[PDB]
Structure formats: C-alpha cells, structure tokens
Design a binder for this molecule. Structure first.
Ligand SMILES: Nc1ncnc2c1ncn2[C@@H]1O[C@H](COP(=O)(O)OP(=O)(O)O)[C@@H](O)[C@H]1O
Lengths: 67, 51, 116, 160, 838
C-alpha cells in the first residue's frame, strides 16, 4: 500500500549530490560508515550507473577523499 | 492527498473513393455458430434405475 | 439447404475403412483405408490411422459438395466379433469433429441366424 | 486459412484470415487490390489486398460456388462481380452498392467460366458451364435481357 | 563526352524559338558549367518550366558517355499534377528521345527504367534524400517555382545546400569516386536574394541569372461592388462573357473541388452540346471527381477542412467598409459566327483530379465551342493554359492561417497577396490583349491584399520541426533556412515534442511521432486524436478538440454580467446550471455537453437553443461542421482503411458518458496539454500561498511547470480565469489543474484557460510516455520490497518527480504519489514499461 512523505530521494544519494557540488564528501562518509550494512548493500547495489556516470564517479572520488 | 483510480491503459457505406492511380478502395464489411445436431441413444431397461 | 452422403464406416480387424457414398450406394467417393495413411503395417487398424483417414475423407467430401453424412457403422460380421471395435468410434469422432453434419447413426453389422 | 505472400523481398505472410468454408475458387482483379474468394457454401467474400481484410461479405447465394470474375478497368466507378454456381445460375453483384444486380436461373450444371466486357453502360457477359451452353447476356445496369446461346460441343471450363 | 545528339519536332522547335527561353540558354549552360548553384529568375508564360531540362539533356546531364555527369536528372515540381503534366509534356518535346522522361508522384512508385530525365515531387525526393543522405544517383536537381516559399521548398533547399556542399567537396578532388551535383533553381518573382544572398543559407555566393519574356496588354477591371457569393458572381459574369464578348478562352480562379465541380456542371448545363461525344466527355469530367492519397504520397493544400472561419454579409461589409448597369469589361462587340449560346468546352482543374482529366485541358475544343477552365493555383506558375484571353479571379486561395495563444487555428481560404494576385491577373493579356476581371473593388485590393508570406511563417514551428524529424534530419538548430525561425521557439518546439513523445532523449522520431507528423494539424491535437481510440471516447474527444479549435461558444461577458438585467443574469446562470451542467465541476464537461446537446434538437428547432442558452450562431454551426471533417481525418489516418471511410450522422452527433469515460477523456486532454499543468501553491510553498477558504477563487495561486522561480513572489503565481466553473462555484480547487493558454489581465494577473483536474495517477500514466518525469530510486524504507525476476527486470515501487527537480535551476517541479512500476533496464538506466493496477 502507499505511504505519504517519501518525497524524492534518500539521504545517501541526496548527501552525495550535495557533497559533489560542495567538493568534499566528509559528511557523506560519516553517514555511510554509520548506518547498517544491510542498508549499505541495499543502496550501493543501485547507484544509477548510466552514460554520464555522475553518481559512480562521485562515489569513487568520495572514497578517494575518504582514504 | 486523495489519489484517483483510472486505468488509462494501452454500418457499411454505399460509395467509393478510388486512388490517384486507378485502384478502387471500398469501405469496411459487416461482421460475420456451429450446428444444431442431436444424438438419440437408447437405454436398455436393466440399467434404467441406475440412470 | 444440405445434401447427404452415407459413411459406411467399416471397423474391421487389422484395418479400418471409411468411404462416403451418395445415398444410393453406387457412386462411392474417396475410398480410404487405415493402411494408406500410417506407415508401419502394425497399426493399420490404429484409432489415429482411422482418425486422419476420416479427416481426409471429410476434406474430399467437402471438396465435392456433400455436407451431411448419414453414418452407418459395420463390423466384420459373419461368425466373428459382430460388434464395432475401436476404429469405428475413432473414425466417428473424427468426422463428427471435422465440420461435417452427422445424421442417423446406426449398426448394419450382419447377423448370422446360426451359420457355420 | 487464407494467406497472402507479398512477392517482393519481404516474402513474409502479410495477412492471414480465417475464412468460413474451405474454398476452391479465387480471382483477383484485372487491376490489383481486389481478391474475391467464395467457399463451398454460399458466401463470396472479397478483400482489399493492400490492407488485407474483408471488404464485402455476400452471403447471397446457394450451393457451392463455381468460378467467378471481376469487371475491372483502372479508375472506374462500376466494379461488378460475376459469381457462378454449381446448381446452374449466375447472380451478378456489384461492389459499389453491395446489391444483387440480376438473378439469373437458367443453367443445368456447374457454371464454370464466365467473363464480362463492355462494347459500346452496355457490359455484355458470357457464362459457360459443365453443360454445353455459353449463353451470353446483354446485362444493362438497370434491367437486363438475353441474346444468342451458340452452343459449343465441349464441357467448357474457363470460357475466356 | 561533350554531348549526345538531340532531336525535336519542327513545330515545337519553332515554338521554343518564338518563346524567349531560347535566348539565354547558352549563358545559362555556361553559368552551369562554371558554377553549380545557379539561380534563374524567370516567370510563368516564359517556357522555363518545360525546356530547361531539355537544355540540360542537351548539355549532357543524363549522358553516360560524359564521365563528369553520368547520373540521373531530377525535376522537382512541388505539385504532383505539375509533375505528371510536365512529364508528358517533355515526353512530347524530346520526341524520339521522349521515352527518356518519367514521373514519380508518390513514394510507393519507384523509378521507371526507360527514363534518365525524370520528374518527381518535392516530398518524394526528400524521402529519397532521407534514405540516401549521400545522393549518388542524381547528377542534377531542378527546383522550379521555389518562389512560393512552401515548407517543402524550405526544407528542400535547406537540405540541398549542405548536400551540394558535401557532394562538391568530395567531388572536386576526385571525379571518379564522386560526381558533381548541379542545382538549378527557378522562381516567378525576382526576390531570390533570400535563396541566393543569404549567408546562413549560402556562405558561398551563387550566381544569379534572368531570362524573362513578353506580355500583351492585360486590361484589369475592378467591380463597383463586391459580392458575398463569389461563385454566383463569377458565374453570372462568365455567362455574360461567353454571351457577349469576342472569342478567347476563360480561366476562372476559384477555390475548391466542390465549388469548381458545381460551376463546371452549371456551365455545361448553360452551354450544352447536342453531340454524344462531347456530352459523354463532359460526363466523364463530371464523373471522375475525387482522390486523396492520404499517407503513401506527398501532401498539398487540399486537406479541404481544418478551418474554423465563419462568415456573414455585415461581417464582409465591415471588413471592406473603406470602399465608400454600365460595368467594366462590357465594351467590345460580339463577333459574327459567335452565338451568345455557343457550346462551351468546360474543364475543371483541381489538384485532386485523375490523370485522364488532367490531360484533357490541352485538347482543342469542337468548332463553334469555346474553351473554358475553372481552376485554382495549379495554373498560376507551374501550368499555363494555351489559349485564354479572359481570366476572372476571386482573389482567395486556400492556405494555412494560425494565430497564437487564443485557439484560432484554421486551414481556411484567406485573401491572396498583391504580387500573387497580379501574377494571376497577368494571365489575361497572355495570348492577345486580354481581360482580367477581379471580383471585388480596387479599394479592397488596396487595403486587405498585402504586397509580398512563407508557409514557415504561417505554420507552427513544432509541426515544422516534426516534419523535419519525419524527414530525418537532426542538426536542426543550425539548419540553413531562408527564414530561420526563432531559436528560442524551435528549442521550445523540440522540448514540446520530447514532452509529447515524438522525440526521444537522443532526438530521433518515434512511431507515434511519425503518426503525429502525418497529421495536418497541431502536435498537441494530433497527440489527442492519435491516443483517444480507446474504450469509445472518440466522439467526446473530437467534440472537445473541435470546440477548442473553433473558439469560445458561450455568450458570457460580451453583454450584461436593473429591473431586467438581474432576471436575465439569473436565467443565464440557470442556463449554466441546466443541461450544460450535469456531470462534475471540473471545467470542460460543459463545453462537451453543449455540443452533445446539438443532438437533442430537431433541425427546424435550430435558433431557440442558441438564442436561449447564449451561444454564437456561426461558431456553433461551424463546430458541428468541423466535427464531421475532423473525425473523417483521424478515422482516415488511424483506421485500417485509409481513404474509403465515411462519416455517418449519429456517431458524429453524440452519446452520454458516465464516469469511466469522463475520467478517460480527462487523461486524454492531459495527453493533449501535458506541459500546461498547474499546482495549488500549498504543495510547494504553503507559507506564501495562505491557503484559506476566504481567499477568492481567482486568487488561489497556481504554478506552471518549467517556469523560473526567482525570489519575487508573483513569478509563477498565475491565477484562474473568471470564465470557468470555478469563479462561479469555488468550494475547494483540486490540486492539479490543466489549462490551454494564458492571458494577462489588467491587474498584472496572468489568468488561465483552465480545463480539468487529475489527482496523481492518470497524470503519471500520461507523463510516462513523455520525457517530463524523471524517476527516483526504488523506495522500500517502510513499505513492501522490490521483487526482481532477473538482473535486468524490476517490480519496484517508486515516487515520480514531474518537473525535473534534479539540479534545480529554478525550473519548478513537484513530486507525485508513490506508484508501482515494471522496469526493463535499458543500457544502464531503468526505463518503465507499464504500471501495476491495485
Ligand atoms: N502539359 C502541357 N501540354 C502542353 N502544353 C503545356 C503543358 N504544360 C505547359 N504547357 C505550355 O507551355 C508554355 C510554357 O509554360 P511552362 O514552361 O509550362 O511554364 P513557365 O512559363 O513558368 O516556364 C505555356 O504557355 C503552357 O501553356
């Protein structure tokens, strides 16, 4: 059944887009370390991988700035 | 916050108009049952009460 | 307006015959057997053999022009089984299915009055 | 099961219809795009072949249906159909008004081989048969009459 | 190599010497030898339509022996009647070479074998060029009468400029692997600078030439009045001409096939033959009447109805009110041997004629009978009639007229220009000193006849770029037109076609896009009439699109709105709340039901409903005129039998829709106007909206898609029009509304043209085909899980976002309710196939 207030996107990809426009990913990694591994797999399996590759190169540069 | 529910999915004539190259072209046809058969089978009167 | 043939379906042993005639009896139309469809010599009395035999007879008789068939089942008679085998019902089911109107199913198997 | 194969490089089954009776006579027009087919009961369907489906039904008749013919000149407004028969008759239909033009009961066997032409709407036709009679008619558009019989000694099949 | 020997007959040879197109042939062929793009600025009555391809065959175009030009020759008449008539003409002209001439008028016709100098049609060689972007075959291309500024001519030369550029570029280094391409353009006027000296069309400046002729004196006569029934005016005038005037044939410039056939049968009735041969010839001309060639051919200006026009006598006279017995042209004496009731060799000529009536113009009449043509613009520049002296002109030609943002869109017969009108009048003094009768006054001819416009200006750019996409050219933003339109507007057109589903995100046309491009109508209405062949809603939808295309029927505030005014406004509101209103309160069901009410009325009961329920007579009659024709058009294009369909009466008339059909037509008009949607501002800015019941109903702010949201308040905040059922009842407006267009009122409030209301899900189902909405990731936080079948399938549960709020550069957009989709994983992204019902 439906459920209201599920507005556009979850906080991982929202913070990823905000971090990519803000040139650092520190809060994104602070969330990503924090939340649960089942949820981590559930978001990281769907990273919107298609022809401009924005989300996936943002994730790779986020892990670069992480380690 | 009230969402509706809608699917939104997926006679004849008596004249002609032919073509620019001859070639006539008529309008549509009307629409187009199996049989009326019968079979009689006799019952011997010792299997009558079982029937 | 329909016209009538007569089936004369012969449910013999080791063979099955179907040949519709016009209802005098002289001018036979499309004699087939059970042998001239299957290729094994073991089941030329097959129900399947009689089935496609009756299908081919139905096609040829609709080609000629007869639409209904008074059907007459004959077993081999004599001092023998006196009663139709399976091939008779097989041909009957086939040409009752195959678009042909059926009339007056009978039994014309000969009865001996105690011959030899 | 009626099918049509486009003869060109697309040799696929373009259209496929389920006709009523097993038929044994077909004729396409002198032009293209008209195909008439009549079964072995009384039903003569005609089909526009481009966008292939039924354009006329023509229940009409009686008995199994013998040979038939079109009347086609390119860019006309006449478009008749000939419609022979087994019990001897010729029942001419048009295609622009879906009406039986003239009922003609005169023959004695299967009316094979009939043909339609005009000579100055005159439109003389000629219908042979398995009987030995070729029996041409004047065949006006409103009301028709007869002329000579001229009797060949054959069993005429497709008297062109 | 140089040339092959040609031959012609003696009388056509001396006719070519007598007509002045033989004088400039050597200078033209040397300009062709020295430059490819050659301009000719001739005229009608010269001979340049006929004999210049014969000059090209003389020059060696079509000669296999020349290694420079071994190719085909294509002559591109824009009208297929012109193509076949000039095909048989040059087949007569080349004579013993005359079997080398051919025609190709539709796409299904391919090249005939015996020709090397072949005629064709504009759309025919554009589809030829489309599937042959290289154009190996044709050594030359002849664009005649390109002065008309057709959309086909514009797209034609816009492709042909880059075509001849790339072909010459590949040829000039190597003649073996690449041949030349000689482009030869003609015209009737001399304003060919928009073809030659346009730097966007041609950075390289091409040479311009002339080769015009001579003309006998045309005596032009303008009438003291101007008649309403121009057919009866022209008929009365032409019976007086054939009764009293000296001999010389007649050309009657009139409008359409129906009027022309009526005038031809009336002229044959007035001047009949006793002879059976000529009587049967006129009978054949009256019998062979119509042809359409809907899809598998090129199209012309004989769609014969897309026109919401209307008329009256006070309307005509108020249009020509600047104009404030012995009549001109009635001067010369009737000659002996010419009876007043002479037989007349009458011939119709419209573009929808068969070939065996298109050849009968050029036959000499019986002796004692005078020749006569009743026609339209085919005999203006392409064709010319050998023997006319009197031409008589109604001054009205059927073309495209469309004005914007108000629901006026008509393919109507307007008023012809001054230049084209004088070009029509110049066919009078053509065989001798002739007489043109213009069926109006010279004050009318002064005022409402403009001097010098293109179809690319008269037609919407969305249909223009859809036409280019169906012809499969993709570099449209920088494509060389003579009048390149507004780049803002054509980018909005590409955006609109992406919104409607004609164009994908890589800009290639879809099948639904080609079925839109087949229509001679707007892309929005074409989408409507393509989609609504579902669950018996087509009479309702054709009534709605006919109403929006004809205009407002309701007499509402062009009048009142003390002792009778109150009762009249009260009974007017009662007529609103009567049979105009029974179904809902959205907006447009009244606009459906007033036309559904035109079935509940006998014909002699005609005036009482308009005069009671406040409807306009001519617009209410032309909507029920337009409905039959529009249903004919869309049934002809989408049904399985193209041409042979007919329209009966009750199926254009009516039935009554209950609930499923009103919500289905609601999503149909959503598919019509998917980018003219609007939201109540509580779901974007609930603080600025001030959502209360005592705010007036024309003050609850609405916000459109794709519009910029700057920190000013009233940027997107556009409001409801007073002429809806809101502002009349106004209880609580539903959140998502539709409009047709926007009109700014005097209080700087952009009022609307509101239509209907959707909640979430038919809006999503409509938008799915379009490229409006961008999906989210699968959202299964508290809900039920995504079920897969495969690594490329998905049964997930996603919220859609309408107005593309990803990287929000102020294009305002809103989310929808969550919906279950069925994805397919195309090329890295997850497109959607369908939805899932509950
Ligand atoms: N199909 C045809 N048959 C006979 N004569 C024609 C035909 N078409 C045009 N003509 C005549 O040829 C002459 C030359 O005109 P044409 O070359 O067709 O146009 P333009 O003057 O624009 O070049 C005209 O006077 C016209 O009457």
């Amino acid at each position: 059944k439906v459920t209201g207030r599920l507005g556009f996107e979850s906080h991982f990809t929202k913070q990823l887009r905000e971090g990519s426009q803000s040139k650092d990913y520190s809060s994104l990694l602070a969330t990503l370390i924090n939340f649960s591994p089942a949820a981590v797999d559930l978001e990281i399996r769907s990273l919107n991988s298609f022809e401009p590759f924005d989300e996936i190169v943002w994730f790779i540069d986020a892990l670069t700035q992480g380690l | 916050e009230d969402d509706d529910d809608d699917v939104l999915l997926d006679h004849e004539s008596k004249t002609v108009v032919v073509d620019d190259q001859g070639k006539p072209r008529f309008t549509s046809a009307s629409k187009t049952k199996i049989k009326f058969e019968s079979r009689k089978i006799m019952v011997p009167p010792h299997r009558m009460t079982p029937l | 307006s329909q016209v009538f043939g007569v089936a004369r379906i012969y449910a013999s042993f080791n063979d099955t015959f179907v040949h519709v005639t016009d209802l005098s009896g002289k001018e036979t139309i499309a004699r087939v057997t059970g042998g001239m469809k299957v290729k094994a010599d073991r089941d030329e009395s097959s129900p399947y053999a009689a089935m496609l035999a009756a299908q081919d007879v139905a096609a040829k008789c609709k080609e000629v022009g007869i639409t209904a068939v008074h059907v007459k089942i004959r077993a081999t008679g004599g001092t023998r089984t006196k009663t139709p085998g399976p091939g008779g019902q097989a041909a009957l089911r086939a040409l009752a299915r195959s678009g042909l109107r059926i009339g007056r199913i009978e039994d014309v198997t000969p009865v001996p009055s105690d011959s030899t | 099961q009626l099918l049509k194969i486009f003869h060109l490089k697309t040799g696929k089954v373009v259209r496929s219809m389920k006709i009523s009776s097993p038929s044994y006579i077909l004729d396409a027009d002198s032009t293209s795009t008209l195909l008439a087919v009549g079964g072995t009961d009384g039903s003569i369907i005609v089909v526009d072949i481009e966008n292939g489906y039924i354009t006329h039904s023509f229940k009409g008749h009686g008995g199994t249906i013998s040979s038939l013919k079109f009347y086609g000149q390119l860019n006309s407004k006449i478009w008749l159909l000939a419609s022979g028969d087994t019990n001897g008759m010729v029942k001419v239909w048009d295609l622009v008004k879906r009406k039986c033009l003239h009922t003609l009961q005169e023959h004695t066997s299967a009316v094979r081989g009939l043909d339609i032409i005009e000579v100055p709407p005159s439109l003389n036709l000629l219908s042979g048969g398995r009987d030995d009679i070729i029996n041409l008619w004047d065949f006006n558009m409103k009301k028709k009459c007869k002329l000579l019989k001229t009797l060949p000694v054959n069993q005429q099949v497709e008297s062109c | 190599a140089f040339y092959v020997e040609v031959s012609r007959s003696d009388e056509i040879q001396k006719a070519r010497i007598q007509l002045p197109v033989f004088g400039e042939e050597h200078k033209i062929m040397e300009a062709i030898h020295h430059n490819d793009v050659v301009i000719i600025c001739g005229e009608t009555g010269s001979g340049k339509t006929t004999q210049v391809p014969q000059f090209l065959y003389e020059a060696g175009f079509g000669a296999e022996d020349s290694p420079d030009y071994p190719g085909m020759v294509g002559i591109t008449q824009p009208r297929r009647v012109a193509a076949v008539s000039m095909a048989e003409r040059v087949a007569n002209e080349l004579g013993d070479h005359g079997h080398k001439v051919g025609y190709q008028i539709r796409f299904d016709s391919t090249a005939k074998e015996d020709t090397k100098v072949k005629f064709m049609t504009d759309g025919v060689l554009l589809r030829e060029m489309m599937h042959d972007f290289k154009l190996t075959k044709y050594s030359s291309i002849i664009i005649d009468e390109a002065h008309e500024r057709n959309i086909n001519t514009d797209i034609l030369i816009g492709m042909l400029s880059r075509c001849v550029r790339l072909r010459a570029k590949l040829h000039k280094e190597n003649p073996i692997e690449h041949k030349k391409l000689k482009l030869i353009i003609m015209s009737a006027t001399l304003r060919v600078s928009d073809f030659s000296e346009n730097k966007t069309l041609f950075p390289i400046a091409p040479p311009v030439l002339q080769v015009d002729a001579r003309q006998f004196p045309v005596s032009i006569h303008f009438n003291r009045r101007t008649a309403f029934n121009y057919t009866d005016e022209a008929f009365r005038k032409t019976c007086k001409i054939h009764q009293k005037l000296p001999p010389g044939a007649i050309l009657v410039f009139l409008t359409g096939q129906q009027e022309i056939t009526h005038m031809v049968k009336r002229l044959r009735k007035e001047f009949p033959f006793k002879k059976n041969s000529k009587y049967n010839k006129d009978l054949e001309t009256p019998v062979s009447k119509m042809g359409i060639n809907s899809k598998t051919t090129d199209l012309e200006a004989e769609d014969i109805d897309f026109s919401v026009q209307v008329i009256d006598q006070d309307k005509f006279k108020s249009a020509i009110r600047y104009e404030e017995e012995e009549e001109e042209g009635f001067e010369e004496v009737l000659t002996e041997g010419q009876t007043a009731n002479d037989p007349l060799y009458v011939l119709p000529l419209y573009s929808l004629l068969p070939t065996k009536e298109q050849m009968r113009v050029f036959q000499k009449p019986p002796q004692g009978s005078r020749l006569c043509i009743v026609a339209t613009n085919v005999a203006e520049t392409s064709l010319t009639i050998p023997g006319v002296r009197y031409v008589v002109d109604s001054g009205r030609s059927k073309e495209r007229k469309y004005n914007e943002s108000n629901g006026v869109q008509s393919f109507e017969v307007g008023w012809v220009s001054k230049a084209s009108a004088n070009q029509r009048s110049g066919r009078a003094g053509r065989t001798g000193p002739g007489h043109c009768y213009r069926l109006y006054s010279s004050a009318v001819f002064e005022h409402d006849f403009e001097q010098f416009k293109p179809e690319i200006l008269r037609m919407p750019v969305e249909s223009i770029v859809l036409q280019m996409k169906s012809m499969a050219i993709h570099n449209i933003i920088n494509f060389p037109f003579p009048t390149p339109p507004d780049r803002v507007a054509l980018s909005k057109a590409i955006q609109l076609l992406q919104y409607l589903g004609a164009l994908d995100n890589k800009e290639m046309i879809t099948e639904d896009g080609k079925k839109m491009s087949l229509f001679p109508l707007s892309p929005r209405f074409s989408k409507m009439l393509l989609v609504s062949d579902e669950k018996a809603c087509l009479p309702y939808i054709v009534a709605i699109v006919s109403a929006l295309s004809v205009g407002d029927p309701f007499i509402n505030e062009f009048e009142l709105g003390p002792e009778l005014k109150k009762e009249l406004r009260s009974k007017f509101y009662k007529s609103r709340s009567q049979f105009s209103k029974l179904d809902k309160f959205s907006d447009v069901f009244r606009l459906l039901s007033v036309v559904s009410a035109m079935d509940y009325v006998p014909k002699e009961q005609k005036e009482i409903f308009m005069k009671k329920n406040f409807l306009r007579g001519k617009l209410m009659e032309e909507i029920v005129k337009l409905r039959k024709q529009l249903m004919y058009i869309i049934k002809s294009n989408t049904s399985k039998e193209n041409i042979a369909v007919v329209i009966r009466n009750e199926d254009l008339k009516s039935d009554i829709p209950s609930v499923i059909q009103i919500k289905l037509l609601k999503q149909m008009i959503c598919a019509g106007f998917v980018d003219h949607v609007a939201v109540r501002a509580d779901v974007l800015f609930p603080d600025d909206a001030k959502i209360t019941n005592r705010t007036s109903i024309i003050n609850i702010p609405y916000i459109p898609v794709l519009a910029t949201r700057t920190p000013n308040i009233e940027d997107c905040f556009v409001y409801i029009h007073p002429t809806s059922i809101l502002n009349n009842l106004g209880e609580m407006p539903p959140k998502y509304m539709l409009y047709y267009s926007l009109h700014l009122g005097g209080n700087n409030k952009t009022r609307m043209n509101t239509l209907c209301d959707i909640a979430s899900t038919p809006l999503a189902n409509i938008a799915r085909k379009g490229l409006l909405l961008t999906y989210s990731k699968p959202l299964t936080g508290q809900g039920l899980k995504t079920v897969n079948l495969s690594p490329t399938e998905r049964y997930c549960y996603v919220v859609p976002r309408f107005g593309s709020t990803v990287d929000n550069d102020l294009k305002i957009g809103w989310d929808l309710n969550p919906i279950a989709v069925h994805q397919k994983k195309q090329k890295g992204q997850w497109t959607v196939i369908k939805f899932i019902t509950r």
